[PDB]
Amino acid sequence: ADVKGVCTEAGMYALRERRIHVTQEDFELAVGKVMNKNQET
Amino acid sequence: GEITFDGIGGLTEQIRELREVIELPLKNPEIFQRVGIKPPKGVLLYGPPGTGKTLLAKAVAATIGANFIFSPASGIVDKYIGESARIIREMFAYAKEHEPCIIFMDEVDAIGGRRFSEGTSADREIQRTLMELLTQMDGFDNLGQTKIIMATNRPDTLDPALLRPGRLDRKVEIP
Amino acid sequence: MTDRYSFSLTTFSPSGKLGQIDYALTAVKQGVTSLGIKATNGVVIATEKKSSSPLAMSETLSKVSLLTPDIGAVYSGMGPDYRVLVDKSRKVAHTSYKRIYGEYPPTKLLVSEVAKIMQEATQSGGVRPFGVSLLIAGHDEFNGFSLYQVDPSGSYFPWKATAIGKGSVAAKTFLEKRWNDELELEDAIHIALLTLKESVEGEFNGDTIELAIIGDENPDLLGYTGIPTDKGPRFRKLTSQEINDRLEAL
Amino acid sequence: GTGYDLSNSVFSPDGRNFQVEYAVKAVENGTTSIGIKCNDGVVFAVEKLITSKLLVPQKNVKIQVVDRHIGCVYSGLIPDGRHLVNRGREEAASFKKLYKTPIPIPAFADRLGQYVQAHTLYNSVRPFGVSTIFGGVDKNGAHLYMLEPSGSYWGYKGAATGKGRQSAKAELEKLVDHHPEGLSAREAVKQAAKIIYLAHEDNKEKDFELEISWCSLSETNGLHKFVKGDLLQEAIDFAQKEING
Amino acid sequence: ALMYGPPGTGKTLLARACAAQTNATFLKLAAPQLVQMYIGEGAKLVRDAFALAKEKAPTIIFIDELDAIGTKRFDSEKSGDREVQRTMLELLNQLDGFSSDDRVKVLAATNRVDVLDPALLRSGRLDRKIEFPLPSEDSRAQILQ
Amino acid sequence: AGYDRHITIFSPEGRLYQVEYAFKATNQTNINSLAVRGKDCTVVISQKKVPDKLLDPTTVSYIFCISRTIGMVVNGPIPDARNAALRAKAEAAEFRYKYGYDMPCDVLAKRMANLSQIYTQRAYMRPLGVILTFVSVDEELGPSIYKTDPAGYYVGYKATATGPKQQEITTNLENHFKKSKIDHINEESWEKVVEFAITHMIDALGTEFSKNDLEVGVATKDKFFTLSAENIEERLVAIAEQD
Amino acid sequence: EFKKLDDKPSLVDVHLLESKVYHKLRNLAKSKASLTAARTAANSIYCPTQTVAELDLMSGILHCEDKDYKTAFSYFFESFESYHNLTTHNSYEKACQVLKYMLLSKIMLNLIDDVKNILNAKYTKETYQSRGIDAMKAVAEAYNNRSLLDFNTALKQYEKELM
Amino acid sequence: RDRRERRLIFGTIASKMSLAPEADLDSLIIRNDSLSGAVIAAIMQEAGLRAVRKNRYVILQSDLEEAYATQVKTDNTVDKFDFYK
Amino acid sequence: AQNDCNSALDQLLVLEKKTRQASDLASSKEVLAKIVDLLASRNKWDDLNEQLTLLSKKHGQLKLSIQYMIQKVMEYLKSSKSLDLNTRISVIETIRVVTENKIFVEVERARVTKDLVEIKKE
């Protein structure tokens, strides 16, 4: 389910920067976002 | 109202709080308008109805010369399509024409519950009612020459929506 | 007439858990951010000072207590449980060791003595168990500087840095990265202010941090200015001005 | 709410345990007893209920002595009141031996207070359901005290408790005002008797037998003694004169 | 007045006696009939009761149960029990409305006192709270005769 | 076990229901207190009312003199207040024999706190409801105010208040102390110290009170005394002598 | 580099500068996005009062170039209140630049009356007079009378500092 | 709402109502720690409304303070929690 | 000379007891007319005015007694003019019993303001 979330979070980054595709870059940043949540205090 | 405000003095504390929320904006919008903070919204009287709460509600109406609108909350519970929408709407429209006005809601648990147990039997009619009051409030239409005063013995079958500021903000207690 | 309560108030649940220990732990998670660091050239412990009131002394308030001369403890949990526990720990440490072996108990041995108090209290009825967790940071001349965790049940485990309270995990991340052994005590004080600034936001000062170190000597901490006979304390609590001086030191 | 109706070993949010409420209630459900402080003394009087002619006078007086100069009378339930007093007595004997002096009325208030309060920290001991009005003359003046069942107590100028508590405070409050505190100890028997009469008006399902006692430093000399004979008899007459019916 | 306390002594029988003596019209109004699952209609029924009662004066409105102009609790189930808060409230609001004139009486009867909204504190509501005790030797003997 | 409020044991949440309810409704008994520090005195003002004309208000006590020098101000009810008084008195006396020295506020506070905690863990006793403010003018610290509260928590103050006019009292003293750069006012005579107290009191609770409606307890070096009824009016008239 | 070495206080600094670079190159879009990141970063951590207000100064500066004089008004309002409570402990460049901008935003918005109110006010203008403050008063007034002569006059005298 | 976030909400409502050089934010930052954006806006708005019913046209930092302190409590609860004071 | 002044002063201490500050005795213009008119006699009207103004800041047999007396003395000050004219300002700022804040009602209240305001305009 997280692999599906990564793509959708990556997409908001792509969309802001007004691209007509998603890039690899967006996906790394998206993985970083999910890992941040898992570690919760 | 059918009973005087100065004549029921010795109920003094409650009288003064009620004057200051109600009378001053109704007579003089101009002061609330100059500061740039809105006139008061909705007032709650809570604590015993049998100590002479009811007397106070009538009494405030008497001094302003406001139109006193007494509502049976259950009567707002018709079992037909929209009769129940129609009543809220009529009550408000008429308040604006006949402003100043007190809209007095007698024991609010039936138009402003919390749910029976989280379940439903008839406690969705209660929700249909309750969304309409929150909508008028939230709306573009603003309460300041129509005042609504809610009454109930206990605050433990008021909805959390109402208890949140901006649907009631003034809460008078009977001391 | 009088009590008859002897039935244990700590009992097993269908899963193998112990209701009272589970409850008590919720309190500890919600308690004040405390950490402990072994700098290797010392041990620095820091905890949040707080005030009840600006018109209130916080001299009386107890967030860092000396359990035995070379050893300090700090906690997250329930303040009243902490205060009594410190007392039973001080008493047994003094009677049973300080002229029997002629010195303080070793750190590990003192962690076991605390552990026992908490476990008596968990086994036995008439009383509910302690609701606390401690970080016992220490020095003993037969084990160096140490850091332990003491759990509510009295389970303990060795650590070389940790944090407990609210916002622990991330506090450990910053500490893990910045310190990896062989580090000046001073430097560990600096790292510790940095970890806690990121951890606590809204208002931050060194007047809301209470800092103690075990990691110094003065002649004043032999307790006499004459001719040595023994080594004496190495516990020293800093005053607020000294802490602001280390906050100014980058 | 709950747990506080069966226990006392935990604290109500109301600040007042439901079991404690029930203890007060049984006090109002007894008989009337009162107490009058005066300008030299204290006079105690009680309404003793007459139900049948199978009961015997002055052996079911609810006035019980502690020490020598303290007279103790109560409203509520009989067994609670006697056990409370038997404990007072024992502390009183202990007192006298140890300090070679009689037990104070303030001391005795404390002694009682601590036995009641002890049973209101514990769910394993059940407290007392009586209010006891007591007093006397001691080395440090005259005292009227009232002990209530919480373990609340104070010194009063005047006291009533029971069924007839209200009517008694009314009739007392008029008489005390008129006087400086209640005039003479002699006068106080007549005054007392009027108070009992007004208090009877809340009963009216039983007849009563009037019983008074006093402790006076000017007309008894510091001892607790019953008021009987001539003095009681003039007092019945005074009451029936002014109070009609 | 509000009565609670045990019948099985002729509580019902006493109520009718008072009715006969004052020359009141006795109206037995059953609290479960109002309590309608339908809108308001129950509210109207309370008003009609007063209306006829005022025309027929003297009158005792004798209320079988107290469980359906009451028992509303203080919890969040007082939501469900709306119909019962509303029938009651109106009947009281209406009595104090006309308190100076004694035309209509309201009597409620039950074995025992139930949770209710405050109303025992006011002359114009059901002021009076009347207890039934048990008989005694004089009373049993009259009852036997 | 049992339940978490039928006997004293932890709540689901790690809280204790009994200590929080002990904080709340034990200060609403028609009591409001403040304590402020003098230069060479400590002043307490506390409300103290009698609802009958038939209740001798001398016996009515809620400032107690624990020793000849020590005072303890209780906020909360007389059944509780005497359980804490008996303990306080005993502790004071014991201390005096054993350690040869008069009892400090702080030591008494600390001892009572730890004891309450033990009674908090017990399943057949309660924590007392009372809030205890211990006052004197120590020769080992000057004027002192130390307050314990019911959870086994206790802490020292330089000035304190209790009852829900806590905010009002605090703010008036805080602004004042920030300006003057001291938390103790300077004046010798007790009289002027009580006038300083009243000034902040009257403003803050927004009312003045009668002689028999007040009770004022003053700590001095080696004495604690309560002011007679006339003495408490003298002070209220003396500010009004100025007006 | 910054975001995986915990050099998070530095991150706010670079984001603000990254914006200034973008703004000059003519990427008005790039500047807003960068700034929103400095804003996320600033609220991650505890920081000085002055820093926070300084980003808000940039936010109001982009909101004159990307329009919405109203939204520019509202930040510059936030910066100025806070500097009022700092009193005269605000640094010189910061206080002066917000005030230069505040007066300007109103003139474009057509709230001409409110430049004269800033001018009279001295908790919201400070003690400061300089050529800039005199130009804004002169243009806003040159604006009200419908006067071109007056505009040219301010433009020229005031020019070095103003422009 | 973090500290930079609350700060803005006091400012934004404070623009809308009477204000003066007394309307000290520094005081407020200590007084409120992390309450929702709904809650901060609600309170700031109510306090201007309440002052004006107490027959004050002016709003000051003093005015907000006296309104707030009344609304927040009417019963006395000793410090915060049982976890730390 | 002294004796008549004393009967004003001693009778003032009787009046302070007299006044009404709880449900005690009773609020009378009768006593205050004895003090203010016979002190005007012992002394002069200007002297009366300063001493009286300080006395008013404490009790006063309910403040209407004081308000009536303040108007008579005021008419004398105005009549003479010069510094007594100044003295009218001083007196009215010091105490509020003719610019009264205990009640807003009275004709005497308004009158005393209108005369002060008229001299200030002029």
**CATH code (residue C94):** 3.60.20.10
- Domain regions of chain D by residue span: 2-244
Instruction: Report how far apart the first and last C-alpha atoms of chain A are (Å, whole number).
Output: 22
Q: Are F190 and F223 in contact (CB under 8 A)?
A: no
Query: Could you tell me which residues come within 8 angstroms of residue C56 by beta carbon, excluding any fewer than 6 positions away?
Result: F155, F156, F157, F158, F160
Q: How far apart are CA I50 and CA I38, in angstroms?
A: 15
CATH 3.60.20.10 fits D2-244, yes or no: yes
Distance CA D239, CA G63 (A): 95
Give E72's Cβ-side CA count (13 Å radius).
28
Distance CA D131, CA H31 (A): 49
Cα separations in angstroms, G104 against E114, G95, G100, G110, H16? 72, 15, 7, 10, 21
Q: E-strand spans in E1-58?
A: 2-3, 25-30
Whether C135 contacts C36, CB under 8 Å? yes
Are F163 and H82 an interchain contact pair (Cβ–Cβ within 8 Å)? no
In the sheet with D41-50, reading across from the earlier edge strand, the strands are D158-161, D33-37, D41-50, D207-216, D224-227
F203 at interface of H, judged by CB pairs closer than 8 A: no
Residue whose structure tokens are 């029921």: B8
Could you identify the residue written with the tokens 């940039």?
A: G58
Q: Is there a contact between D9 and F126 (Cβ–Cβ < 8 Å)?
A: yes
Residues near E93 by Cβ (< 8 Å), separated by ≥ 6? Answer: B54, B106
Q: Of the residues D2, D31, D32, D132, which is catalytic?
A: D31
- Among positive and negative, which fits the CA dihedral F199, F201, F204, F208? negative
User: How far apart, in whole angstroms, are the C-alpha atoms of residue E42 and residue E40?
Assistant: 5
- Is residue I77 within 8 A of residue I87, CB to CB? The reply is yes
Rounded CA-CA distance C211/C46 in Å is 5
Q: How far apart are CA G139 and CA G152, in angstroms?
A: 9
**CA–CA min distance G121, chain C (Å):** 32
* F215: helix, strand or coil: strand
Give the span between the Cα atoms of D224 and D44, in whole angstroms: 10
DSSP letter string, C112-158:
HHHHHHHHHHHHSSSBPPP-EEEEEEEEETTTEEEEEEE-SSS-EEE
Report DSSP state, residue C40: B
The total number of residues written for chain D in this structure: 245
Binding residues of E for ATP: 5-12
CA distance G129 to G117: 15
Q: Which alpha helices (H) appear in chain F, and where do they start and end?
A: 17-24, 78-98, 105-121, 166-180, 190-205, 229-242
> Nearest-CA distance from H28 to chain C in Å?
11
∠ at Cα F163 (F157, F168), nearest 5°? 75
In the block, tokens 């049992």 appear at F2
CB C109 within 8 A of CB C148: no
Do F88 and F72 form a contact (C-beta atoms < 8 A)? Answer: yes
Residues of chain C contacting residue A40, judged by C-beta atoms under 8 Å apart: 169
Q: How far apart are CA D173 and CA D158, in angstroms?
A: 8
CA-nearest residue of chain E to B73?
E86
Cβ atoms of residues D184 and F112 within 8 Å: no
Q: Which helix (H) or strand (E) holds D113?
A: helix D105-118
| Residues D158/D35, Cβ–Cβ less than 8 Å | yes
Determine the 3-state secondary structure of D128 from DSSP. Answer: coil
Decide: C78 and H82 in contact? Cβ < 8 Å: yes
The 10 Å Cβ neighbour count of residue B69 is: 18
Experimental method: cryo-EM
Give A-chain residues touching C76 at CB under 8 angstroms.
none
Q: What is the resolution of this structure in A?
A: 9.5
- Angle at which helices E42-56 and E82-96 cross, to 10°: 30
**Whole-angstrom Cα Rg for chain D:** 18
Q: For residue H2, give the nearest of C31, C32, C201 by CB distance.
A: C201
User: To which residue do tokens 């893990």 refer?
Assistant: C176
Contacts of the segment C239-242: beta carbons below 8 A, 24+ positions apart: C240/C206, C240/C207
In chain C, the N- to C-terminal Cα span, in Å, equals 66
Chain centre distance of CA C206: 19
What DSSP string describes A12-30?
A: HHHHHTT-SS--HHHHHHH
Question: For chain B, how big is the Rg over CA atoms in Å?
Answer: 16
Secondary structure element (H or E) that encloses residue G39, with its range: helix G28-42
Residues of chain D positioned with their CB less than 8 A from the CB of C1: 124-125
Between the alpha carbon of residue E31 and those of residues C90, C207, E64, the distances in Å are 71, 68, 6
The two structure tokens encoding residue I26: 């009773």
Token pair in block for residue G4 = 């995986």
User: b/e string for F83-101 if b means 16 or more Cβ within 10 A?
Assistant: bbbebbbebbeebeeeeee
Q: What is the DSSP string of F134-166?
A: EEEEETTTEEEEEEE-TTS-EEEESSEEESTTH
My answer on whether omega of the bond before B39 falls inside 30° of 0, hence cis, is no
| Rounded Cα distance, I55 and B138, in Å | 58
Touching, E vs G (3+ Cβ pairs under 8 A): no
Question: Which pair of structure tokens corresponds to residue A34?
Answer: 């999910």
C-beta atoms of C202 and H2 within 8 A? yes
Q: Do C202 and H33 touch (CB under 8 A)?
A: yes
DSSP B51: G
| The two structure tokens encoding residue C230 | 């023994």
Please name each of the domains of chain F with its CATH number.
Answer: 2-242 (3.60.20.10)
User: Which own/partner contact pairs does D164-170 have at CB distance under 8 Å and 24+ positions apart?
Assistant: D164/D31, D164/D32, D164/D47, D164/D198, D164/D199, D164/D200, D164/D201, D164/D202, D164/D203, D165/D28, D165/D32, D165/D75, D166/D202, D167/D198, D167/D199, D167/D201, D167/D202, D168/D32, D168/D34, D168/D195, D168/D198, D168/D199, D169/F54, D170/D198
Domain that holds residue C58: 1-249
- Cβ-based neighbours of G53, under 8 Å, separated by 6 or more: G78, G79, G82, G83, G94
Instruction: Looking at the complex, report in whole angstroms how far the Cα of residue F109 sits from the nearest Cα belonging to chain I.
Output: 42
Question: Residue C78's closest chain H neighbor by CA?
Answer: H83
**Per-residue buried b or exposed e for E67-85, using 16+ beta carbons within 10 Å of the residue's own CB:** ebbbebbeebbbbbbbbbb
Rounded distance between C-alpha atoms, residue F14 and residue F31, angstroms: 31
Q: For F181-187, which contacts have Cβ atoms below 8 Å and span 24 or more sequence positions?
A: F183/C55, F183/F37, F183/F158, F183/F159, F184/F37, F184/F38, F184/F39, F184/F142, F184/F143, F184/F158, F185/F37, F185/F38, F185/F39, F186/F39, F187/F38, F187/F39
Residue in the structure block whose two tokens are 């409001």? F32
Instruction: Read off the DSSP letter of residue H83.
Output: S
- Of the candidates F52, F60, F126, the beta carbon closest to that of D9 is on F126
- How many other C-beta atoms can be found within 10 angstroms of the C-beta atom of residue F52? 14
Min Cα separation C150/chain H (Å): 18
**Annotated catalytic residue D31:** yes
For D43, the 3-state DSSP assignment is: strand
Q: How far is CA E78 from CA B124, B145, E70, E115, F113, in A?
A: 14, 32, 10, 11, 43
| Residues in contact with F177: Cβ distance below 8 Å, sequence separation at least 6, in sequence order | C55, F183
Which amino acids of B are annotated as binding site for ATP, given as ranges?
47-54
CB D86 within 8 A of CB D38: no
- Whether C60 contacts chain F with CB within 8 A: yes
Q: How far is CA G88 from the centre of its chain?
A: 18
Q: Chains with 3 or more CB pairs closer than 8 angstroms to H? A: B, C, F, G
Contact G11, G38 (CB under 8 A): yes
Cβ(C184)–Cβ(C33) under 8 Å?
no
Element spanning C214, H or E: strand C209-214
Neighbour count for residue B51 (Cβ, 10 Å)? 15
Contact D118, D16 (CB under 8 A): no
Say how many domains are in chain C: 1
Q: Which helix (H) or strand (E) holds D197?
A: helix D185-199
| C-alpha dist (Å) from residue B102 to B73, B111, B113 | 15, 18, 22
H or E segment at E13?
helix E11-22
Q: For residues D222 and D69, is the Cβ–Cβ distance under 8 A?
A: yes
H71, exposed or middle or buried, with CB in 10 Å at 0-12, 13-18, 19+?
Answer: middle
- Pairing relationship of beta strands D64-66 and D70-76 according to DSSP bridges: antiparallel
The pair of three-digit structure tokens given for residue C136, joined into one six-digit string: 């016992």
The minimal CB distance from H52 to the residues B35, B165, B169 is found for B35
User: D175 is written with which tokens?
Assistant: 């008489």
- Judging contacts by C-beta atoms under 8 Å, the chain C residues touching residue A41 are 166-170
CA distance D113 to chain F (A): 8
Q: Is D166 on the interface with F (CB under 8 A)?
A: no
